[PDB]
DNA sequence: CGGATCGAGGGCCCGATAT
DNA sequence: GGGCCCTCGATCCG
C-alpha cells in the first residue's frame, strides 16, 4: 500500500486567458474548475492521495528554490475544504480578474525549471509515493519554439523525470488552428508499453473525463487463478469498475478534545467475568428440541468447495444469457502478467475468438477460501474510445454473476391482456417525443451530494448548508410542455373509465 | 402456504437391480427423497409429509379389501417431518423383495390425503411417485384414480431412473448433465408403464403435464421437487409515473434475489452450550497517542471532510440530511436499448413490474407501454424508492413479453459517484501480446469443442442451464447438519459426488475439450513469476 | 490496508383483540 | 408477524 502523489501544473500565459473564440470558458477557467472537481471527488472517495497545484508563467514567483515565474499555490498535501475555497477564488470571469490581480500572467517561463520544481516537490514527501504523476494543463502546442536552449533542456528534464518514475500526462487545451503533439509534448510525455493519445479538450466535461481516467491507478480487487484445465492455468485480476459509493462511517470523538476514540469490543463470560478464549466457544443451531453443535472449524469446513479462482466450464452463446438474470454487480476481468507469464497472450486470443463467435466463457467463481462457488459468465467486452479517444469501454471480460435456482423467485400469475394497436401507436408517439440520451454519469447521488454539501458548509463554520437538488426527479413541467394534447387524447383512449 | 405431500416410493426388488456404474434406482430414489425431506425439515415449513413404500416384504395399509394393495406400507403418516424420519430413510428403510402395483400405491397415498386433511388443513395436495415401472400393473381403476385425483385436487409428480425426453429425442454420472440414464435400460414393460404415466399426467394437467415426469438424476439438480409446494412470492404496489395524467399504478415483486442462509450460528460455551453465558461489552479507549478510556456519555458524533474532522451530532444530521420526496416509480425518460449496457447494472435485486391485479385500465395502460418500447426497441430510465426513508435509485425499465405473461423489468443503474474510470492497456494492437494465427486457430478449435449449446428442430438447447441448478450451499449444509445430528462422534462427511457431478459440465464437453486443450497447452506458454 | 456479509436496529400491514 | 431497508460490526485480502 501507499499514498499517491498528484501534481496539477497549469499554464498562465496570455493564450490561457483567451477564450479561443468559442462559448466555453477560457482554458484557465476550464483548468481551475477541473482541479476543484478532482479535489472534491478525492474528498468523497476513501483515498489518502496527496494533491498539489503549481502555476508557471506568472510574474510573482513563490517556490522552494526561488525560480523565477513559478508559483506553487499548494504543496503536496491532503485535499481540504480550505484548499477548494482557495481554488474557488480563481473560478470564473470574476475569478480570472482575481488571478490577474493576485499574480501576473504571460511572463517568460522555462519548462526545465518548472519540472525541476515539481520533482523537488515530490522529494519533500515522507510517506511512500506509490505513483508520482504530473498533469500539465496548457494550450501552447509548441512552447519555447523561439528558444532552442529552453526546449532542449525541458526535453532532458522530462527524460530525467520518466527515469525517476514520475508520470507526465498532457492536458492539451483548445488552440487556434488545433493542438499539435508533434511540435511539443510528443517526446516529453510518459507513454505506455501498449501504445495513441486523446484529442484536444474543448469542453470541461471532456477535460474532467480525461483527467479522471488517468486520475487513479488501476487497483485490483483481487488476483485470482483462471484454470482452463488442471494443467493450463493463467492469472487474472478482478477489478470492480462500478462500486456503490456510500456515506462515510462516523467517527466517535470526545466532547472537549474532539479527538477520535478507539472502540474495543470485548466478549467475556457471565459466570466468571474474565475474557474467554475462542477455544472454549462453540456454535449451535436449535431445531425444535434438538440442538446441533459445530465447531468454528466445522462451520467453515462446510463452506469449503473450490479453491480461490475461476474454473472454466465452457462457452455459452450470448443469446442464452438473459438480461433479467442480474444478481450482483458485474466485475471486470483483465490479465495479470505479473503473476503468470504468458497469461496476456492466451487472454487476448480468447477475447478475440470469443467476440468473433459471439460466445461467453462460463466459469465457476470462488473468490476466497472456504466459500461456496457461483457460476459466472465472462462476456467479451471490446475496446471503445470516444471522439476525444478516451477509453469508454476497456478490452477484456465482464464477469456477469448468474443466479442459482434458489435466487429465481416464483412469480404471481396474472392474465395476459394485450392492448389494441391504436393504443400502442399512441404510446409510441409519447415515447418518441420523450426520447433522450442516457449517460452513465447523468445523475449524482442526492444523499451523498447533500451529505458532502452539508459537511462543506459546516466545514467553513459559517457556510449555511448547501442544498443539493435531486437530479433523479423528472422534469415534470418540461415533459408536460413537450406533450400537452397527446396526454389528454391518450388518457381518453386508454383510460376511458373515471376512477 | 401449507400443503399435504405424500411420497410414494417403490422399494421392490427391481428397485434393487442395479446397472453397472449407476447407483440402484432404490438408492437414487432414496437420495432424491432425502434431498426433499432435508429442505422441508431444516427450513421448518408447515407442509406435512407422509411416506408410503410399495413392494415391501410386509403389508401395512388402510385399503386391504380382498387382499388388495398388498406389500404396501405406510411407514409415516401425514405429519410434520422430524429427525427420526430422516434417520429412518438414511438407514432403517431397506429394499424389499416383492413388487407392487404403483397405481395401487397411488390409491393408498390418496386415502392418506383424503383422511388426514380433514378441515381444509392444506392449501395444496401433492403426491410424488418414485418408481422404475419395471413391475406389472393393472389398468382397472385408472378412470377412478384420475377422478379421485381431480375431485380431491391432488397434483402428481413422477420420478423414474431414466428420463423420457432424451428417449424420444434419440459413462454415467448421477446429477450430471446429459448422459444420466442408459438408453438401453428401458424394458417393454417399462415402456408400457410409461405410456400410462404419460396419459395420466396429461389427463390431470393437460399437455404440459408431461413436464412433471423427471429422472432421479435431473431431479437432484433442480428444485422441481418443491415446485408444487413452493410459497407464492410477496408482491407490493406502487405507481409508475410516466408523467402527469400518464401515471400507471403497478405492483412489482423481486424477480431475482439472492437466497441466503436462513439459520444463523449462535455462539455458545463449549461446556454449558448456552449463548446466555457469553456476553459482549463495548469499551472505549482513545484512538490517539494515548489509549485512555473515554466516557460513553461524553462521546460525540463526527464526520471527516478530507483532512478536516468536523463534529456533526446525530441530532443535527437527521434535520440537515436529504429528505426523499417519497416512494415512486417516476419515469425520467426513454432511450434506445443500445444506450443501456449490462455492465452498468447495479443493486442486489431485479424487479418485475406487473400490472395491478383486478385492474383492467392499468393492465391495458401498462401493456401499451410495454409494446411501445418493444416495437421501438427502446427502454425507460426511471427513478425508484420503495419508501420515503429509502435512498433514491436510478435504473432501467425494459419490456419483457412472452406468450403467457407481459411485464416490465427494472434493474438499478449507477450514479456518477458509483462509476469508476481506469485506463487499461489495449490488446487489439499490443505488439508484445498479439497471438499467432496458429494460436488463434487453436483457441478457435477449443471454443468450438467446448460449446455448451446444441442448436431437425434447429432450436438452441442449452446443455448447461446454470439458472436451473440449485445453490450447492444449501444441500451441503443440510448434509453436514444431519450427519452431525445423527453421528455426533464421526467427523463431517465429504461433499457428496452428485453435487460435484451436477456442478461440472456434461461429460461430452469435457471429453471433447481434451484434444484442443492439449494443443493449446503447448501453443500457449505458461510460466511462474519468481525473479 | 476496502468489499462483502450478517446481526440488530428501525418503520407499515394484518388476524386476534379487550373494548 | 412478515417484508423491507439501512447502518455498523466483524471477516478477511490488497
Author numbering:
A (entry chain A): 33 to 227, 231 to 534
B (entry chain B): 6 to 175, 182 to 466, 469 to 544
Quote the authors verbatim:
Nonhomologous end joining is a critical mechanism that repairs DNA double-strand breaks in human cells. Nonhomologous end joining (NHEJ) is dependent on several canonical proteins, namely, the heterodimer Ku70/80 (Ku), the large DNA-dependent protein kinase catalytic subunit (DNA-PKcs), DNA ligase IV (Lig4), x-ray repair cross-complementing protein 4 (XRCC4), and XRCC4-like factor (XLF). Following a DSB, the first NHEJ protein that binds the break site is Ku, where it rapidly recruits DNA-PKcs to form the DNA-PK complex or holoenzyme. PAXX (paralog of XRCC4 and XLF) is a more recently identified NHEJ accessory protein, which structurally resembles XRCC4 and XLF [reviewed in (11)].
(C) X-ray crystallography structure of Ku70/80, with the P-KBM bound to one of the heterodimers in the crystallographic unit to 2.97-Å resolution. The crystal structure was determined by molecular replacement to 2.97-Å resolution, and the x-ray map shows the presence of two KuΔC molecules in the asymmetric unit bound to DNA. The two DNA molecules bound to the KuΔC interact through their single-strand overhang, positioning the two Ku heterodimers at close proximity without direct protein:protein contact. Although two Ku molecules are present in the crystallographic asymmetric unit, only one is complexed with the P-KBM, and the entire 28 residues of this peptide were built into this additional electron density (residues 177 to 204). We can therefore highlight that the crystal lattices do not influence the opening and closing of Ku70. The P-KBM is engaged in a groove located between the vWA of Ku70, the core of Ku, and the C-terminal arm of Ku70. This interaction is bipartite, with two clear sites of interaction on Ku. Patch 1 is formed between the N-terminal part of the P-KBM and a groove formed between the vWA domain of Ku70 and the core of Ku. Patch 2 is mediated by the C terminus of the P-KBM and two helices of Ku70 packed against the Ku core.
